[PDB]
Amino acid sequence: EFFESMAESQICKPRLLINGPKGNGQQYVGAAILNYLEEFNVQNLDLASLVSESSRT
Amino acid sequence: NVNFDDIGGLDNYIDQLKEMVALPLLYPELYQNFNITPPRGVLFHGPPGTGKTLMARALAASCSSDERKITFFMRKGADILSKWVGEAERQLRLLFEEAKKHQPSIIFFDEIDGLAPVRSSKQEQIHASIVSTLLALMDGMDNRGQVIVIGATNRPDAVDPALRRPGRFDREFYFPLPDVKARFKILQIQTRKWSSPLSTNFIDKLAFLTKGYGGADLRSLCTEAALISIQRSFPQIYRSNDKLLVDPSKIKVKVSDFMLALKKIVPSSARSTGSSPQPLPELIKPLLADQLNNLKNKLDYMLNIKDTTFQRNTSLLQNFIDYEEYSSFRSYEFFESMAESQICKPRLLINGPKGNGQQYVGAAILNYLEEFNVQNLDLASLVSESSRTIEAAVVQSFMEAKKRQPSVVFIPNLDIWINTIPENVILVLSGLFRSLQSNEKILLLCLAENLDISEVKNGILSDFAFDKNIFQLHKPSKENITRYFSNLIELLKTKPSDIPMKKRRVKPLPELQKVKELILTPEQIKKVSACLIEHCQNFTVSQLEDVHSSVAKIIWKSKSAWDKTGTVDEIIKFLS
Amino acid sequence: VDMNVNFDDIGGLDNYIDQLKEMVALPLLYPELYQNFNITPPRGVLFHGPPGTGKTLMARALAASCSSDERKITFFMRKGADILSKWVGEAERQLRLLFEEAKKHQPSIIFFDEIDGLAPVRSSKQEQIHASIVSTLLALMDGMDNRGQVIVIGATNRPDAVDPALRRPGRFDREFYFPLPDVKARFKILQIQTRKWSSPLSTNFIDKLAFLTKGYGGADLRSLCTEAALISIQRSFPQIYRSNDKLLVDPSKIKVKVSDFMLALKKIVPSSARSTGSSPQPLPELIKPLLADQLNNLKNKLDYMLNIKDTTFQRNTSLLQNFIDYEEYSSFRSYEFFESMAESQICKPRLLINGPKGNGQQYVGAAILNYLEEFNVQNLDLASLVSESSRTIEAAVVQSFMEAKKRQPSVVFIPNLDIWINTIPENVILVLSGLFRSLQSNEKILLLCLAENLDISEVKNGILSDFAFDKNIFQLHKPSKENITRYFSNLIELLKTKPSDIPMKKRRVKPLPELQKVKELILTPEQIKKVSACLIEHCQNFTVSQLEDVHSSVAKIIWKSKSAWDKTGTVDEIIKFLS
Amino acid sequence: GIEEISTPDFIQECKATRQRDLERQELFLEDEEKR
Ligand SMILES: Nc1ncnc2c1ncn2[C@@H]1O[C@H](COP(=O)(O)OP(=O)(O)O)[C@@H](O)[C@H]1O
Ligand SMILES: Nc1ncnc2c1ncn2[C@@H]1O[C@H](COP(=O)(O)OP(=O)(O)O)[C@@H](O)[C@H]1O
């Protein structure tokens, strides 16, 4: 109960914002990161995935 | 089969379901004497995996299946409706004639919200016909026979309100996610047919660890822990392609297998949105216990949780077993008029700065109020279902809070909820709370981050009576930060012989038969604690957890070192 | 499901029993009177009302009560659209065979329970599978050939879901509204359900139960009596709930007491509480000192507004008993003139109750709706408008007003008018005002609006000016000194009680028998006067909500020390709280 | 035609008497072997 709680305390609020000038290779950086985190479960929240299904808002 | 001793908790419902299945058949002269009929139809409702189908199967195959056999028909609501235009009504009629000819019978409609939903959408007219034939078929007040209709659902407002009336489903039973005693009973039921049964202190710690679990999740936990014990005690039977390496039972499911099953099994209360009701975690507890208890004291004052000596609601059959009875008229209605006169208007607004652990305080308060009917008016709880409007969902949640009378209308993140929820349904909720009587036990619990009081006395929440009932979560004190930063020190002072690392075995796995002191002065510990408290000056819980995580990474990175001077120097270098 | 239930089993529907005898039994006995005028008897009634009112009971009692002679009446019964299958064929063919077998056994009653699923309204899509059933039903009910003595009864919750071609003479010429029963009919239902019992209840206890069960239907009263009997079985013989073998009990000394009904009233939620509007109920016994001085005035105002206590015309509870007990006595100048001058007393019934914020309006509205017992309450509050997610606001307001236009003694009820005129859209108030000005004067649709701190400038030259709230504004003033004195006198009567009077339950000294299987209270009267003076002086110019706050805060202190005999500490804590 | 004769109410009645007549033919074969 001590070591599992100090091992799970190493993630606090995992956030990241990559911000550069217009056209500075963001569409490649995002794909390379999502390939690097291939063990995760990626939930895309872009516009092409939300407005695709017409039943759900 | 399943009998009543396979059900953990739910003893009130076991005693209340025996007066409409068992006792009508067993004692037919004590029900004919009063010219009464058993209620004949129950709506089970609750989270998935709580024991509704188990209760129906126990009620079928437990109440005297010896000469007066009770048959059991299990149907799903999505099974009855088909792709045609007349199949569902005829199939319902066939099921009810088949249950009428086998006269003591129990029909069980699992997930009846699919068969008979609420009338707010869905044209092409067939669901009105299915609902009408269902309403006309389960007439329990014209002696159709001895059919008992049991309908299971997640929340009872997803069922058509015409079915929640006398004659149809009379009684509604809430099947909750089990508390610590019921989880103890469930884990004792699941670990009773084992060969090496667990102790009492084992099942107590398993019941304390399994927060937010149901019955099915505890069953999968026990099954997966047993599978890990077979996978660990005799691991040679997997990779070896040979024949039976037969092995006796020296297997014992210890702590290190349940601790892996706990992280391999996800609960069904980790799928519902909002704050899952659970106590404060063991890390943040010294930051938030002292302000939680005051809230509990406030909730013990305005709700009468401790001095509920007139409302001790258990199975009242047990009250008639263990107590006895007692002008004689006045002592009922006068003291029941002054006993319900203690609840006046239960309101509470927990309001602190941003990131001050409100998502933990809400879950801890909802864990304190387990015997209440929590109705969550969270954003993701209303905008998820597309079958209802925000208006109708808020009104139906309030009405389910009004029917089941000890209830909590819980609005997490009120500062967002007054911006992304329109003013129409806020004024609707205001008018619904204003039409309540004062002696009604509907607590309005709202938790807000950095809300202005001008919205509380002059704004849109001015007609909710949050005038004296505002509790202020403040940032934790220095004596609380000093105790919160006292597991990093006890991780700085553990020598690497106690850190449970992995070391390879020098000898291979056998096969069966073929039939120092760590260098850390107390001045360094004192200087680490002093700089770690001096950095966290007037901080919130989120910033304290950020500092705790960023120091724990530095400590756990150098976890095999025996001289902690570099780790202490890196800790002071980060906090500067 | 066609038992021996007759007409003495139904209570409070004595007017429709006469008409059902008029159209089922009396043509069989007397065919010479019906053939004297060349009239066919009316055949086919649509029963409609709230659920749990007695429609199926009336159908079964009509089938069994008129067949007590040797003139048998077969009772064909159909559940609501159980007759249609996955193919196109049997839905019309089974109705054909049903009407043919009803033609064969000539005195017959076909009972369509839940006919709103069998004959629905013609929608935009999915036309075929119900219109092909409505067509054969309409052509079989009032076809060219004589149907015979087949009395068609339908039953529904709402009649608008049935097709309008069915609601027509020859098929459904009579439409019977079964109302949620009043206090005399609830008395009679409670007397009927507790009739077979071995130890019967008293008359005044059934009267007090009839007053306590406001909002209950007939099915709710049956469920109440059933749960009272079950709690009596649990109280007398608990040990049958623990054994799995049939123990030997005796069906005596199991008499139902008052304490079983008082728990059954808590276990039973009626169909009034399942609705989303304001449930009509009397003033609770705590706040009845605070409000019943100024509720009674409202009653007097309503007695001058709706002519409740002046009922000489339109007293039609039962026309046949009216023809039995009373006696008849130019033609226009003795009937039509006096009917016009009796109907011309209701001019435009409106009432706006307007008090300060928290002055007990949620109690006054429910008490007025309890007083208007013979009226049809249509709640135009926000929750009932937005609860049906398929409807719009405008359609719900128009539907509620059109439901109030029929069953003409009706009340359109808008609680929280200050919220209503701020959160309903502005065109809906104009729709409702146009519906109210397109009424005749002599129509008894009362507009009852309750508001909290509403400005008179909004009803003078605002958005409520087109409702004629001119003289009909009643002001709920704050409660005076004597009402607060009586309220806190009941609180003091709680304080000066003994711990032997406070009901604590028991711990039984002996277990239940197994069954054969087959000090002095020290409280000076000066301290009572000090506590009463402090409660009076603290609650100066308070509303009902602040008075209930002080009452709850002092009742908690009193129920803290409910066992202590030295009541000086609780008096000191009470005086310390009000400072 | 037999798609019209085979209707699910008669089908469930015929499965009831089908298990009855399965049991009947079993008892009758053992009866004609024992007698
Ligand atoms: N209260 C309980 N006590 C003991 N076992 C339970 C309980 N609730 C669930 N279970 C376990 O979960 C299973 C029942 O799941 P199910 O009845 O389908 O849940 P639901 O009806 O909520 O979908 C059973 O196999 C049983 O072992
Ligand atoms: N007016 C009444 N008088 C006497 N009993 C009634 C009355 N209304 C209802 N009941 C009781 O309620 C039970 C159920 O009524 P029900 O037929 O379900 O009405 P509905 O079909 O309108 O819901 C009946 O068995 C009857 O005993």
Numbering used by the authors:
A (entry chain F): 757 to 813
B (entry chain A): 410 to 735, 752 to 940, 1319 to 1379
C (entry chain B): 406 to 734, 751 to 939, 1318 to 1378
D (entry chain G): 1097 to 1131
What's in the article?
By cryo-EM analysis, here we show that Yta7 assembles a three-tiered hexamer with a top BRD tier, a middle AAA1 tier, and a bottom AAA2 tier.
We went on to first determine a cryo-EM map of the Yta7 in the presence of 2 mM ADP at an average resolution of 3.1 Å. The Yta7 structure is three tiered with a spiral BRD tier on top followed by the AAA1 and AAA2 tiers, has a dimension of 150  × 150 × 135 Å, and adopts an asymmetrical overall configuration. The active AAA1 coordinates an ADP between the α/β subdomain and the HD, and no ADP is present between the α/β subdomain and the HD in the inactive AAA2. But the six AAA1 domains form a shallow spiral ring enabled by the six well-ordered but differently configured linkers between the AAA1 and AAA2 domains. Based on the density feature and an AlphaFold structural prediction, we unexpectedly identified a 30-residue motif in the N-terminal region (Gly320–Asn349) that interacted with the BRD and referred to it as a BRD-interacting motif (BIM). The BIM is cradled in the U-shaped BRD burying a surface of 890 Å2, over 30% of the total surface. The bottom (proximal) BRD is located above the α2 helices of the AAA1 tier.
